[PDB]
Amino acid sequence: SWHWHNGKWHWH
Amino acid sequence: SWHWHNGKWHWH
Numbered sequence: 157s158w159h160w161h162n163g164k165w166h167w168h
Numbered sequence: 169s170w171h172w173h174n175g176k177w178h179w180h
């Protein structure tokens with residue numbers, strides 16, 4: 157099924 | 169550095 161992925165701040 | 173990941177619709 158569909159899965160919403162929230163936006164997020166990703167530390168590189 | 170910081171990296172903004174947009175939210176998205178992910179098809180499983």
Ligand SMILES: [Cu+2]
Binds near residue numbers: 159160161179180
């Ligand atoms: Cu997903």
Ligand SMILES: [Cu+2]
Binds near residue numbers: 166168171172173
């Ligand atoms: Cu990232």
Ligand code: NA
Binds near residue numbers: 158159
């Ligand atoms: Na979802």
Ligand code: NA
Binds near residue numbers: 161
């Ligand atoms: Na995921």
Ligand code: NA
Binds near residue numbers: 170171172173
């Ligand atoms: Na960015």
Ligand code: NA
Binds near residue numbers: 173
């Ligand atoms: Na990524």
